[PDB]
Design a protein around this nucleic acid. Structure first.
Ligand SMILES: [Ca+2]
Ligand SMILES: [Ca+2]
Lengths: 337, 506, 492, 337
DNA sequence: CTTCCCACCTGCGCCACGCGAGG
DNA sequence: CCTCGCGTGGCGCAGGTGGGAAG
DNA sequence: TTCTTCCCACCTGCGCCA
DNA sequence: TGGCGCAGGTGGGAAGAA
DNA sequence: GGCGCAGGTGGGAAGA
DNA sequence: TCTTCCCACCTGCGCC
DNA sequence: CTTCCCACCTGCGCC
DNA sequence: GGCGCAGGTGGGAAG
C-alpha cells in the first residue's frame, strides 16, 4: 500500500483562505499560550450531554481527543472561523414555521464570489432536512438539536448525513495533513518560515485571493507539493502512448475525421491511473463504494492544475492528451520560496 | 492625528487599489501584465533627505519585480503654489532611486479649476519624464473607513524606469542606535510579540486609561485624543498602533500609571514596576520613580507641602515639571513615551527586524521563536542571537574594526603613548590616559573618517563619556574584556568571540 | 524686499563676460547685450520676480531668462520648490530659467551639485541653469560681485538566438579557440607562425604587397581577437599537413587526404577541409594537373584563390575565402554566447567550459555535452525559439488537430513529409513576417534548397531536446520538455 | 600524540610557482597518460651506472620508487621545471678553469626578482665545490659527474653536501606534504576543485605572483591550513601572559623606560613554543643536531604570516608581543576557498 | 572622599506643512 | 490672490545623572 | 423546450493501528 | 474498542444536442 | 573591401 | 533501381 | 663588528 | 630503506 507522492488537497476544504486563517490562528495563539477556551451555547451543550454524557462539549463538537498545540489551534479555528455562532444556528423559527437560517462561514470561497456555506448550501442539506422534519412534526426541538450535531441516518439505502462532529473530523484531518505535507507547520504545530512568508504576503497584499498569494501557493504546490512530479509522470506516460500510436483513442464518430471524445478521455485517464497505481506504485487507491455516481480519476489534481494555469482549460486534444503549459510550470519552478 | 498624515495613508491605499483594478495605470500597453498586487508602505526612517508621504509597492506576475511609487499628497490648504513644490519633490524622489512618483493633487482650486491638466502640460512639455503619474482627487468624506474610495482618478499614467545608498547630507553613525536602559532585549521581544499579535486579526478596539488621566489630558490639552496624547503618536500606521498597544500594556501599565498613594493622609510612591525585565534579570524595570529626584517623588513632595492640589499633580504627571533655572526640566509621560518609542523603533528598523510597512521580518520571527522556546529574552540562546545580530546586522563589527585599526596605528608609532609615571619609573595606564585615548579615537572617527555624528554639548556637570552604550554592550556580550583598558593595546577586544559570532547565518 | 535685483544684475553682467554658459559653442554670438527687468503682471501665474533679457549681435535676436532666488532662510526644502518653479517659467513661454542658490547650507554641503544631478539624470532638459553664490556682503553696493559661480549652464532584422553552423561551430572548435586565446593572453610575445615557401610565393603572385599570413587568414587588423584567430587557423584547422594541395607519387598527382586536428561532433574521426568528395578544392586541382590545363604554380594560385564557376555552378573557393566564412561564424557564435568579451578575452563561462573540457575527457564528453546544451538553451536563447514554435504549434493544432494531415491508405489521416515541410514553412512565415524575430533574405536560385530551421532542428535533435522522430500527427515537432526542464536549471 | 596541527611548508621549496606548475603538469599528464619519459644527458646515465649497478636512470635521480600517478607527475615536474637540462650542467666554462654556469630554473621566486636556483649562488654550494676540486685536480671529470649525483662527504667541520638525488627527495617530500595537507590534490594525485581554482586564477590573472593568486594562497593557508588555529593559540597565550603584566619581558632602556629588545622577543617566543609543545601537545619537536647556528623558533610560520600580511612587518611590539593584524585575517577568513 | 558604570532620564537639529503679511 | 517669512509638529537620534561599588 | 454530461463547492466514511 | 490519514460521493450551474 | 551571418550541395541510409 | 532526408563540408550577400 | 631574515640546504625517526 | 617532516646556514640589509 504505497502512499501518494504529492500533497493531499481537497476542493472545498484545503482552500487558500483556510490555510491562511489556520496559520493566523496558530501564530496568534503562539504568543498567547494561555488562551482560556472557545465558547458554545446552552442548547448545544445540552444536546451534547444528551448524546454523550460525561464528555467535554468543546472537544466533542470539534472531534478532538488531546489538548496539544495543534489540537488547540484546530479548536480555535473550527469554532471561530468555520463553525461560527452564526453558522451553529440550526433553524429560524419565524411565524410558526422553521427554515434554514442562511448563515455563511467567515472563509472565502477561493473565487471571490462570496463566503463558503456549511451544512445548508442547497436542498437536502442537514439544516434543510432538520427544518423539514420539524415542520412535519416528526421530531421535536431537542431531537433536532441532537441531530444537528449527531447527524441523521439514512432513511432508505441512500447515504447517511453528517453532523458537526463528523464534518469537523473530516475538515481537520484533511487540512492538517495538507499543511504538514507542504511543510508550513512544524511537528509540534508552530508555523515555519514559509508559513510566516505566506502570512506576510496575505496580510500585506490584500488577502489570500490576491495575485501574490496565488503565485506563492502555486509555486509551493509545484515544488513542495510535488505536483511537478505528477505532471512529469503524466507527460512521460502520455507521450509514450501517442508516439507508438498518435490515434490511440480516436473513437471515429464522424465519417472520415476521428475526434477525441469524452469517453476516450475517460479511457485514457483510467489507463494513466492504472499505470500510476499498479505499475509505478506511486498513487494510493481504495475500493470504491457501490453508488450511482463516482468521482473521476484525478478529480482534484486536474482542477487544481487547471485553475492555476499549469494545464489548459480545454483539457482535450487528439494527439497530446492533457495539454500541459510548460512555460508557466518552468516559471513557477524558479520562485525559490 | 495630523490632518495631513492621516489622509496620506488613505490616498496611498486608494491608489494601490486603483492600480490593482487597472494594471495599465502604471504599465504600458505593449507590456501590460495579466494582473498585479499593490500595497501601501512608507519610506524607511534612515533613507535620504527627500521624504515622501508614502510609497505604493507593486508586485506583478513575476513574483520578484517589486517596485515602488513614491507618493506626494497635496492639500487645498497650501494654496495653488504647492503644484510646483509637488513637481520638485517628484523629481527628487525620481533621483532618490524610485521607479515612479505619483502626485495626488486635488482636482479643485480657487484660482483655476484645471490643476491636473496644467500639471500634465508642464510635465509632458518640459519635464519629459514618463514615470511621473498625476491623480486629481475630490474632497474626501472623513467619516468612513475608506474616505477616498471612488474619489480619485488617474489623470496621467506612469511608466516604470535602486542604489539609494549615498544620501549625502552630512555624516551619519554607521552602527545601530542602541541605548542602555530603554532599548533592551525584552523590550524588543515584547514589541515584536505585540506586533505579531496585532498583525493577525487587526483592528483591536483600543487601549484605555483612567478617568483622572483623561480629565488631566483634556485640561492641559483641549480637543485631543487622550491615547494619542499619552502615547505621543500622530498617525494610524500599523507600527503606530503596535507602539500604542505596547506602551500602555507593558511599560505604562495601569499599576505603573498610578502616581501617588494616600496612605495615612500623606502622599507617597506606589512602588510599582513595569512588566519588562531588566538586562540583569534581577527585577523588572522602573519608570518615573526609584530615586530622590524622580517625577513621582517630586509630585508627592509638592502635594505634601501643599504647593499643588490633586488636579495640578495629575496635570504634572503627564506634562512634566519645569525647572526654575537650576536643574533640568522634568519629563512627563508624553515626552518619555516619545523618547522610548524613538529609541526602540529606530533600533528595530536598523536591525532589520521589522519591515518598512511595519510587519516583522523572518529574523524577527526567529527571535520570537527563540525567546518563546528557550524561556524568555534573557535565555542564553536569546543572548547569543542578539549578540550575533548586533555584530552582523548592526555594524558593531565595523566599529570594532575601526577602533582596532586606529588604536594599532596610534600604538605602532609609539608604545606607552598615553601612559604616565607610576610608583617608580614604570609607566601605568591610568583612567586619564584611557579617557584621552577614547577622546582621540572619537575625534578621528568624527572629524576625519566621517563615520560618527556629533551634535553639541548640553553644558552640564556630567559629560556622557565617549563610548558609553557601545562599550557597555560589547563588554556585556563578551566582545571586549571585562578589564576596560590595558597598557599595550588599549581596548582589549576578544577576536575569538567576534569571529565566532560573525558566522552564525542568522 | 528688493534683494534678487542685485543677483539678477550680477548674473546679467556675468553673462556678457562669459558667453559660453548662455550660448552653445556651436553658435556662440560675438557680442551679447544683457539687461534686467521685472515681469508684467499678465506674464503668467508664476510671479517671475526677475528676468534677464539677453540679445545676440543681430537685431532680431531676443531671449529672456527668468531667474529664481532662494534665500538660505527657506532651507533645503526650497531646492525642490526652485526646481518646480523653473519648469513653470519654461511653460509660461520663456527661453530659459536660472536657479540662484547659496553655495552651501547648514545641513546640505553641496546644494548646487545635487540640483545639477537632479536636472541631468531625470529632467533631461537643458533650458534651465544653476548658479551657486557665496555669502554676500551687504555693505558693498554690489554684494554678489564675484560671489556667483556657475555650476550647470543652459542651452538657449535579428535572429534573436545564437547563430550556429552545422560544420563550423563544433565543440572542439570552441574549446581550442578558447585555449589558444588563454595561452596567447598568458604569453603575448608569442612568435608569428610560418608559411611554406610555395605558399608565400603563390600569395605574392596573386596579390603583390600583401602579408602572407594576413592574407591566408582573411584578416586586416592587429588586435587580440585577430591574433588568436590567426593562431587557431594556422595551428588547428590549416595545419601544414592540411595545407598540402597534392601528392606527387609515381608521377600522378593525387589529393593527400590529410585531416585537421579538430574532432568531429560524432567523434568518428577528425574534420577535413577541401577534400573527401568527388569534387573538392584539393581534387579538382589534382585532376586539372593530371590533365595538364594548369601548371604547379597555377595549381598553388588556384588553391590559394579558388576556382571560378566556369558556368552553371558555384565558384569553388580557396583557403583565403573559406577562412573568412570559418572565422566570422565562430567569432559571432562565441560573442553571442558571451564566452569572450568585446576585446576577445575568455569570460568566466568560457573558462568554465575550458575547465570542464580539460578536467574531463574532452569536448565530446558527457559533461561537455551537458554544459554546451545548457549554454545553448539558456545563454543562446534557444529556449525562446522553442517557446515560440511551441506556442504557434499549439495555437494552430488547437483549432484543428488534423491541420496538415493527408488521407492515408484506408482514409485514416497520416502526417506525411509534405505536411511536415508545409507546417515548417508556415512556422517560418509566422516567425519572420509576423513575430519579426528572424532576419531572412532570399535568393540563390539553385537546383537544391536548404531545409527550414536546418541547423536549429539539427542541434536540438542531437542534444535530445526534441525526439528522433522529427514529426508527429498531433504536436507537430515533438519537443522533449523533461530535457529542457533539466537544462534550464544548470546555472552555468 | 605529537603531530603538528597546521600545514607543513618551507621557505624556498613550497612556493606558489612550485605548486602552480606541479598542478599544471598533473592536469596535462592526466589528459594524456601515454607520454614519453623525460630524457637525461649521456654521461649522467653513465655516472648513475657508476653509482648504482642496477638502478634505473630516472628512478634514481628522483628518489622515486614503484609506479603511480603521483610519481609520474613528480618526475615530470622535477625533470622539466627544477632539474632542467640547462640546470643539470655542473661546469660550463672549460676554457682555462671550470666555473659555475649560473643556470636558473623555470620556477619563479616569491619576491619575483628572478627565477629560482639550486646548487649555485654561494661559495658553499655543490657546483662551486666540485669545480674547485676539479680545477685543482683533486677529482676527475667522471668523478665530478659522479659526485654531482651522489654528494661529497663531510670533508670539513660537521656537515655533508647534498647531490641531486637527496635534494630531489627533500623537495619531493616537502611539496607532496604541503599539497596533501592543503587538500589540493586527491589521494591518487588527481587535483581537486580547489587546485583547479588555483590553476584557473593563476593562468587567468598573470601567474602565481599576481594579487589574485596571493590572495587565494593566503585564504587557503588561513582556512584549509590550520594557520588560524595557530594564530588564535599564540594570540590567546600572549594576551594571557600580558594581562598579568603589560610590561612583561621588558628591560630598562636609555632613560629607564622599558623596551622590548630582541632577547625579550626570543624568550617570549621560546615560552610560546614550550607552551605549544609540552603543554598543549600541538607541535612536534626533535633534536637540534648540535650545530653552531640554530633556526629560530617559528621560522617558516612567522615568515609566511609576515609576508602574507597576517602579521605586521615590525615583528614585535611592547605590550602585545606579535602584532597580529586582525582586519586582514577576518577578511580572509570569509572566503570560499 | 573620589571616580566609574549602568539603569534611569532629557532634549537638539531639522524637514515639511500650515497660517499669515506684503505686494 | 501669489509668494515667501516665520512658527511649529514630529521625528530621529544623541546627550545627562543618581546610587552602588571599589579604591 | 427538454435530456444528457462535465465541473467545482459541498459532502461522507474506509482502513489500518494501539 | 476509537482516533487518525487520508480516500471516495453528489447537486446544482453551464454547455451542447435532439 | 571587410564584416555580420544568411544560404548550398556530396553521400550514406532508408527505403519506394 | 530510384526518391528523399539528414549531416558534414562548402558559398556569398547586403551594408559604411 | 653584530644580528636578523629568507632563500638555499640537510638530515631525523620509524615503521 | 623509503617516506613524512623536522632541523641548519650564507649573504644582504640595518644598526
Ligand atoms: Ca504633502
Ligand atoms: Ca524669490
Amino acid at each position: 500500500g504505497p502512499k501518494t507522492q504529492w500533497v493531499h488537497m481537497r476542493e472545498g476544504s484545503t482552500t487558500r483562505d483556510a490555510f491562511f486563517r489556520f496559520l493566523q490562528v496558530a501564530k496568534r495563539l503562539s504568543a498567547d499560550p494561555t488562551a482560556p477556551r472557545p465558547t458554545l451555547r446552552s442548547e448545544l451543550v445540552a444536546a451534547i450531554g444528551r448524546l454523550a454524557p460525561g464528555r467535554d462539549p468543546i472537544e466533542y463538537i470539534t472531534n478532538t481527543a488531546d489538548n496539544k498545540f495543534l489540537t488547540k489551534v484546530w479548536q480555535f479555528f473550527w469554532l471561530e472561523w468555520l463553525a461560527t455562532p452564526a453558522v451553529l444556528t440550526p433553524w429560524k423559527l419565524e411565524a410558526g414555521v422553521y427554515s434554514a437560517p442562511g448563515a455563511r462561514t467567515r472563509i472565502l470561497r477561493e473565487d471571490g464570489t462570496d463566503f463558503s456555506q456549511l451544512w445548508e448550501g442547497r436542498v437536502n442539506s442537514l439544516k434543510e432536512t432538520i427544518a423539514g422534519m420539524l415542520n412535519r412534526g416528526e421530531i421535536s426541538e431537542a431531537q433536532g438539536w441532537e441531530a444537528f450535531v449527531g447527524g441523521i441516518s439514512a432513511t432508505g439505502g441512500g447515504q447517511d448525513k453528517q453532523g458537526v462532529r463528523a464534518r469537523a473530523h473530516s475538515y481537520r484531518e484533511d487540512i492538517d495533513s495538507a499543511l504538514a505535507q507542504l511543510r508550513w507547520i512544524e511537528d509540534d504545530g508552530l508555523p515555519t518560515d514559509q508559513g510566516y512568508r505566506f502570512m506576510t504576503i496575505c496580510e500585506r497584499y490584500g488577502g489570500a485571493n490576491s495575485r501574490a498569494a496565488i503565485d506563492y501557493m502555486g509555486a509551493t504546490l509545484i515544488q513542495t507539493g510535488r505536483y511537478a512530479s505528477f505532471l512529469h509522470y503524466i507527460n512521460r506516460l502520455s507521450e509514450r502512448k501517442f508516439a507508438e500510436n498518435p490515434l490511440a483513442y480516436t473513437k471515429p464518430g464522424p465519417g472520415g475525421m476521428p475526434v477525441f471524445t469524452e469517453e476516450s478521455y475517460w479511457e485514457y485517464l483510467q489507463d494513466l491511473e492504472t499505470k500510476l497505481t499498479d505499475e509505478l506504485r506511486v498513487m494510493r487507491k481504495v475500493s470504491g463504494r457501490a453508488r450511482p455516481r463516482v468521482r473521476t480519476t484525478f478529480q482534484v489534481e486536474l482542477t487544481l492544475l487547471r485553475n492555476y494555469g499549469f494545464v489548459s482549460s480545454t483539457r482535450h486534444r487528439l494527439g497530446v492528451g492533457i495539454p500541459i503549459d510548460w512555460e508557466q510550470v518552468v516559471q513557477a519552478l524558479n520562485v525559490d520560496l | 492625528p495630523y490632518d495631513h498624515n492621516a489622509e496620506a495613508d488613505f490616498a496611498a491605499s486608494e491608489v494601490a487599489r486603483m492600480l490593482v483594478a487597472d494594471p495599465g495605470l502604471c504599465y504600458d500597453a505593449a507590456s501590460l501584465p495579466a494582473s498585479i498586487s499593490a500595497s501601501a508602505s512608507y519610506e524607511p526612517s534612515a533613507a535620504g533627505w527627500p521624504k515622501a508621504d508614502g510609497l505604493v509597492s507593486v508586485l506583478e506576475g513575476g513574483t520578484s519585480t517589486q517596485r515602488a511609487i513614491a507618493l506626494e499628497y497635496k492639500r487645498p490648504q497650501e494654496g495653488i503654489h504647492g503644484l510646483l513644490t509637488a513637481i520638485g519633490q517628484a523629481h527628487g524622489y525620481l533621483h532618490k532611486g524610485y521607479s515612479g512618483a505619483a502626485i495626488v493633487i486635488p482636482g479643485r482650486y480657487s484660482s483655476h479649476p484645471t490643476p491636473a491638466e496644467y500639471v500634465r502640460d508642464v510635465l509632458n512639455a518640459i519635464s519629459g519624464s514618463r514615470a511621473i503619474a498625476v491623480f486629481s482627487y475630490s474632497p474626501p468624506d472623513t467619516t468612513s473607513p475608506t474616505p477616498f474610495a471612488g474619489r480619485i482618478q488617474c489623470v496621467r499614467p506612469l511608466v516604470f524606469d535602486v542604489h539609494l545608498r549615498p544620501a549625502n547630507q552630512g555624516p551619519k553613525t554607521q552602527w545601530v542606535h542602541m541605548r542602555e536602559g530603554s532599548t533592551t532585549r525584552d523590550a524588543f521581544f515584547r514589541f515584536l510579540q505585540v506586533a505579531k499579535r496585532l498583525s493577525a486579526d487587526p483592528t483591536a478596539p483600543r487601549p484605555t486609561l483612567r478617568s483622572e488621566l483623561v480629565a488631566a489630558i483634556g485640561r492641559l490639552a483641549p480637543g485631543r485624543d487622550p491615547i494619542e496624547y499619552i502615547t505621543n503618536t500622530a498617525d494610524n500606521k500599523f507600527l503606530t498602533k503596535v507602539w500604542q498597544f505596547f506602551w500602555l500594556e507593558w511599560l505604562a501599565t495601569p499599576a505603573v500609571l498610578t502616581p501617588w498613594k494616600l496612605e495615612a493622609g500623606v502622599y507617597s510612591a506606589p512602588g510599582a514596576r513595569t512588566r519588562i525585565l531588566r538586562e540583569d534579570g534581577t527585577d523588572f524595570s522602573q519608570l518615573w520613580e526609584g530615586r530622590v529626584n524622580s517625577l513621582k517623588e517630586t509630585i508627592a513632595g509638592m502635594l505634601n507641602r501643599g504647593e499643588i492640589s490633586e488636579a495640578q499633580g495629575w496635570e504634572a504627571f503627564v506634562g512634566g515639571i519645569s525647572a526654575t533655572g537650576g536643574g533640568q526640566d522634568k519629563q512627563g509621560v508624553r515626552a518619555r513615551a516619545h523618547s522610548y518609542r524613538e529609541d526602540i523603533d529606530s533600533a528595530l528598523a536598523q536591525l532589520r527586524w521589522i519591515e518598512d510597512d511595519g510587519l516583522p521580518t523572518d529574523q524577527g520571527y526567529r527571535f520570537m521563536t527563540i525567546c518563546e522556546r528557550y524561556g524568555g529574552a534573557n535565555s542564553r540562546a536569546a543572548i547569543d542571537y542578539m549578540g550575533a545580530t548586533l555584530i552582523q546586522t548592526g555594524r558593531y563589527a565595523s566599529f570594532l574594526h575601526y577602533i582596532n585599526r586606529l588604536s594599532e596605528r596610534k600604538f605602532a608609532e609609539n608604545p606607552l603613548a598615553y601612559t604616565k609615571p607610576g610608583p617608580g619609573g614604570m609607566p601605568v595606564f591610568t583612567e586619564e590616559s584611557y579617557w584621552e585615548y577614547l577622546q582621540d579615537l572619537e575625534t578621528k572617527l568624527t572629524d576625519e573618517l566621517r563615520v560618527m555624528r556629533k551634535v553639541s554639548g548640553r553644558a552640564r556637570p556630567r559629560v556622557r563619556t565617549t563610548f558609553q552604550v557601545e562599550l557597555t554592550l560589547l563588554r556585556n556580550y563578551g566582545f571586549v574584556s571585562s578589564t576596560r583598558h590595558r597598557l599595550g593595546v588599549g581596548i582589549p577586544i576578544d577576536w575569538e568571540q567576534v569571529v565566532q559570532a560573525l558566522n552564525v547565518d542568522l
